[PDB]
Design a protein around this nucleic acid. Structure first.
Ligand SMILES: [Mg+2]
Ligand SMILES: [Mg+2]
Ligand SMILES: [Mg+2]
Ligand SMILES: [Mg+2]
Ligand SMILES: [Mg+2]
Ligand SMILES: [Mg+2]
Lengths: 180, 105, 186, 148, 201
RNA sequence: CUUGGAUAAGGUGCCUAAAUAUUCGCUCAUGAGAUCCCAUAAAAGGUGUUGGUUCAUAUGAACUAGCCCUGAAAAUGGAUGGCGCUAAAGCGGA
């Protein structure tokens, strides 16, 4: 409802096969789950992987479905773990990371930001393997363990964030950051 | 205690320009209590008066006025674009104008 | 990563009066009063007078910042020890051929050093505020420097040592000087 | 156990800590930036260090939603709510505790309400206020004159 | 910016942020008077900023140093120069804008009895994280030959004493007026009292 | 040759029209950094700090790559275009 807070990532489910021939008249069928900005990009990634892994090119194949999976409990908090593969300036590596969110694409949005911030890796050099959900007894990264104690409390130490019309330039008393 | 006001105060900034070009058909105005784009839209039809003084008498008097209109906003902070009947001279770029309230709604 | 909470607890000894208001500390005892300020590192500290134990706690912090908690705790322990039992640094002055002569003046301040490697000149050092210089009653060539503040006493002990450094000879063979030989309490 | 005497007791109620107003299920949180600005809510859940789930039951005009923590202003009041409550139980609790109406009696709530009242005044009402002040001035100035 | 004059005290403000907000006000047309310029802050270590001033000191017209960069070193003339570099001071209009700024060290008479304003969008407390290093302008300018840091401090002590006495008398006056106000509310017709109470006056 | 509307390339701290906008990470430099052509920098190093992989009962290791640092010396006084900027007005994203 507030568009200043939205990401543009959604999840899709695509099914496709090869055009039947005489040497092969009932070919294999394939499915994937892709995160993208819209359905057209999801189809583009699907055909890219069809070519890289199997011997399918879009020109001699056909598409069977495009679904756009939605999420079931968008206000319950889950734990997620992600498996990656990306290219550096001098080689290629693969990684495992963990996030906390209320949606899978919400976690993928965080992942792209973090991989850009920490390693200067562009979206064009990242392949995503196997997003899933993980139980709280099998979490590994310390920064997620901190968030699942019994009675979690802490003070709020951030500076104020105010509307533009109350953001006045000549004050008459210098303000305070304490705010108890 | 006399001479009621009935207008909001304003200050005339320069022309509508870019870096290195001028376009003097429009002029930019600042309104005193208005500092968001959405509050500037409130004034988008009112008449604008620019009053100044001379040294000789012209029609018995030493005051004359140039009339204008409020046409649109200028983006995120409450500046407005105004159009006048003649072009405002450049020797006025910090002077005072009256944003009237005549065409009342 | 940022940790949520972090704490450490420091007991208070018997004959000590403590006060902390805005990260500013004062402690008192038999041998004087010590002041110290800590308004350069983000902490909120908590003093329980009914029992012992000042406590230091830091909210969201990184490894670089989290390393300052034990530092403050050790400083607090040091100034507790200071007011009840004074610090003591013992020093020995050593020579090969020319004996060194010391003389203490001005109410047990301001030692005077003569005949270092046979020089006919005179060298002076002046004690930091709250320090006293006096010579041992037991052994031949020892000095006592002492009193209530580890920082000032150690700095006086180092100032005396830097005053008789040897110029351009081989310092592995020419070993004359004044050296710190024991750190203890009174 | 052995319990705590009155001595220790009030002594606990005398340590005024530097930090009050923790984030937890039940805090009040006036909202400061965004489309829901100037409204009240409650923390029901925290996602990360920076993100929080916030909910103002159907009493206030805010739905259940995720929000960046830096847009909020913690208040003095807290309700003691349960493990994983939903909006329905929260409405019952806030109704039976009377917390919103005693925020209205505090220093900030009174001035917020008075500002609201002042904003929808009419022209005749503004004249009435001006007239009342003009009347009060005369009594001020006669009492002051009688004093000296 | 619809006032005859604004008085700012610069204690606790960052030099660049404050200088950028003064210059636009001057260009739009507004007299500005800045006081206590010796308390301005900068956002590096003191040694690092002294190195920068040393670099500024060694550039001069080779053939005749009477011309060329003039190395002003009073803490208020430094703010004057930093503001001058954010204006088009080589046109007539931009030279008019520069003449509308007045800078002082300490707080001389006409302004010790005025109202001072601050700019929160440039305060050190709100802009600079607490483990970063910063310096004070008066110390830096004394390190490069200004020589009046002690005298202004001595003057400010007396100014603050006089201000304290003034504040005492003012608080007494407000109390003595509040009691008169609360007594006179009972001498008014009920309608005026009710309308005053409804709007919280 | 003109009147009005809405853009491209590129920009929105001041010079200078338009964000001291919002939302995530990283970085402290006693010669920081700041985007085509474009106006120089390497081998070799770091017990600076941040992520990741593989071995050994909660410590010891070995590797890997982001920002920062050493390597880094010229002649009139000078140049991210200037001021300046470190809860960025820097670098990678939305
Ligand atoms: Mg030699
Ligand atoms: Mg046109
Ligand atoms: Mg502008
Ligand atoms: Mg080893
Ligand atoms: Mg440039
Ligand atoms: Mg710029």
């Amino acid at each position: 409802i507030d568009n200043s807070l939205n990401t543009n990532i959604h999840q899709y489910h695509i099914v496709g096969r090869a055009i039947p021939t005489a040497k092969d008249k009932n070919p294999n069928v394939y499915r994937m789950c892709i995160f993208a900005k819209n359905d057209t990009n999801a189809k583009s990634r699907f055909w890219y992987f069809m070519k890289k892994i199997n011997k399918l090119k879009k020109s001699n194949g056909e598409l069977l479905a495009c679904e756009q999976i939605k999420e079931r409990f968008p206000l319950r908090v889950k734990n997620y773990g992600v498996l990656l593969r990306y290219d550096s300036r001098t080689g290629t590596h693969n990684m495992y990371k963990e996030f906390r969110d209320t949606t899978k694409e919400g976690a993928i949005a965080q992942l792209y930001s973090e991989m850009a911030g920490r390693h200067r890796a562009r979206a064009s050099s990242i392949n995503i393997i196997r997003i899933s959900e993980i139980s709280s007894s099998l979490v590994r990264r310390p920064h997620i363990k901190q968030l699942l104690k019994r009675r979690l409390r802490f003070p709020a130490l951030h500076l104020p964030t105010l509307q533009k019309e109350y953001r006045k330039k000549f004050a008459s008393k210098r303000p305070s950051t304490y705010r108890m | 205690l006399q001479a009621v006001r009935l207008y909001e105060k304003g200050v005339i900034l320069g022309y509508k320009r870019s870096q290195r070009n001028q376009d003097p058909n429009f002029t930019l105005i600042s309104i005193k209590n208005v500092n968001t784009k959405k509050h500037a839209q409130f004034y988008v039809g009112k008449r604008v008066a620019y009053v100044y003084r001379t040294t000789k008498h012209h029609d018995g008097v030493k005051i004359k006025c140039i009339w204008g209109k409020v046409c649109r906003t200028h983006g995120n902070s409450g500046v407005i674009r105004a159009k006048f009947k003649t072009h405002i001279p450049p020797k006025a770029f910090g002077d005072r104008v009256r944003i009237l309230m005549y065409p009342s709604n | 990563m940022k940790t949520i909470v972090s704490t450490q607890k420091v007991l208070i000894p018997e004959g000590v009066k403590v006060a902390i208001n805005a990260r500013k500390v004062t402690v008192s005892g038999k041998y004087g009063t010590l002041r110290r300020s800590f308004r350069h590192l983000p902490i909120d500290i908590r003093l329980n007078k009914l029992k012992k134990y000042i406590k230091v706690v830091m909210w969201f912090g990184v490894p670089d910042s989290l390393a300052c908690i034990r530092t403050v705790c050790t400083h607090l322990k040091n100034m507790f020890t200071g007011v009840t039992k004074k610090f003591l640094y013992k020093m020995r002055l050593v020579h090969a051929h020319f004996p060194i002569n010391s003389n203490i003046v001005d109410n047990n301040t301001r030692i005077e050093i003569r005949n270092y490697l046979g020089e006919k000149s005179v060298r002076f050092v002046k004690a930091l505020p709250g320090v006293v210089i006096e010579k041992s009653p037991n052994v031949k060539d020892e000095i006592y420097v002492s009193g209530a503040d580890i920082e000032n006493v150690s700095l006086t002990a180092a100032l005396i040592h830097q005053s008789v450094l040897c110029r351009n000879k081989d310092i592995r063979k020419f070993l004359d000087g004044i050296y710190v030989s024991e750190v203890t309490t009174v | 156990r052995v319990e705590l005497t009155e001595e220790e007791k009030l002594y606990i109620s005398k340590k005024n800590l530097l930090f009050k107003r923790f984030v937890e299920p039940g805090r009040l949180c006036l909202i400061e930036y965004g489309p829901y600005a100037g409204k009240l809510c409650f923390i029901v859940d925290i996602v990360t260090i920076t993100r929080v789930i916030v909910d103002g039951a159907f009493i206030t005009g805010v739905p259940r939603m995720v929000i960046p923590l830096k847009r909020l202003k913690l208040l003095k009041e807290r309700i003691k709510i349960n493990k994983n409550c939903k909006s329905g139980f929260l409405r019952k609790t806030v109704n039976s505790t009377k917390v919103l109406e005693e925020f209205n009696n505090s220093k900030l709530g009174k001035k917020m309400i008075i500002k609201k009242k002042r904003d929808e005044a009419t022209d005749f009402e503004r004249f009435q206020v001006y007239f009342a002040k003009r009347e009060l001035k005369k009594k001020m100035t006669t009492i002051k004159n009688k004093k000296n | 910016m619809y006032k005859k004059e604004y008085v700012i005290d610069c204690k606790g403000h960052l030099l660049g942020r404050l200088a950028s907000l003064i210059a636009k006000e001057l260009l739009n047309g507004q007299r500005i008077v800045a006081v206590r310029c010796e308390d301005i802050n900068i956002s590096g270590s003191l040694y690092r900023n002294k190195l920068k001033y040393q670099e500024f000191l060694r550039l001069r017209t080779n053939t005749n140093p009477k011309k060329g960069p003039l190395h002003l070193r009073e803490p208020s003339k430094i703010l004057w120069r930093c503001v001058r570099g954010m204006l088009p001071h080589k046109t007539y209009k931009g030279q008019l804008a520069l003449k509308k700024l007045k800078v002082c060290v300490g707080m001389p008479y006409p302004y010790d009895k005025k109202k001072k304003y601050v700019l929160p969008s440039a305060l050190r407390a709100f802009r600079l994280k607490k483990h970063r290093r910063y310096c004070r302008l008066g110390t830096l300018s004394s390190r490069v030959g200004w020589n009046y840091d002690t005298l202004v401090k001595k003057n400010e002590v007396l100014r603050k004493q006089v201000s304290k006495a003034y504040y005492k008398k003012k608080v007494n006056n407000l109390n003595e007026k509040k009691e008169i106000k609360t007594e006179a509310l009972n001498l008014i017709n009920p309608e005026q009292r009710q309308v005053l109470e409804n709007f919280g006056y």
